[PDB]
From a paper:
Here, we study fold transition between distinct β-barrels by protein engineering and structural biology technique. Here, we discover that the previously reconstructed ancient DPBB sequence could also adopt a β-barrel fold named Double-Zeta β-barrel (DZBB), as a metamorphic protein. The DZBB fold is not found in any modern protein, although its structure shares similarities with RIFT and OB. Furthermore, the reconstructed OB fold could also be converted to the four-stranded SH3 fold by a simple circular permutation.
Given the high similarity between the OB and SH3 folds, they are presumed to have evolved from a common ancestral protein. Loren Williams’ group suggested that the four-stranded core fold of OB could have transformed to SH3 by a simple circular permutation (or vice versa). Following this evolutionary hypothesis, we tried to convert the reconstructed OB proteins to the SH3 fold. While design-23 had a random-coil structure, design-24 exhibited a CD spectrum for a folded protein and remained almost intact even at 90 °C. We also determined its crystal structure and confirmed that design-24 adopted the four-stranded SH3 fold. This experimental conversion from OB to SH3 strongly supports the previous hypothesis that these folds could have emerged by a simple permutation of their four-stranded core fold. In contrast, the reconstructed OB and SH3 proteins did not interact significantly with any oligonucleotides.
Author numbering: 3 to 52
The structure:
């Protein structure tokens, strides 16, 4: 149920940190939503939506 602008916790360099959801995509292979998240410093990452 994660949507654009929401905030989630992920690991970055062994530390639990907050990232902001900037985009919702879909992985046809895993048949599951994927979110483009952006960290405080501007780094981005793709994460499978829990």
């Amino acid at each position: 149920g994660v949507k654009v602008g929401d905030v989630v916790e992920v690991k970055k360099d062994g530390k639990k940190v907050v990232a902001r959801v900037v985009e919702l995509l879909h992985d046809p292979a895993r048949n599951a939503p994927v979110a483009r998240v952006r960290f405080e410093d501007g780094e981005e990452r793709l994460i499978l939506v829990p």
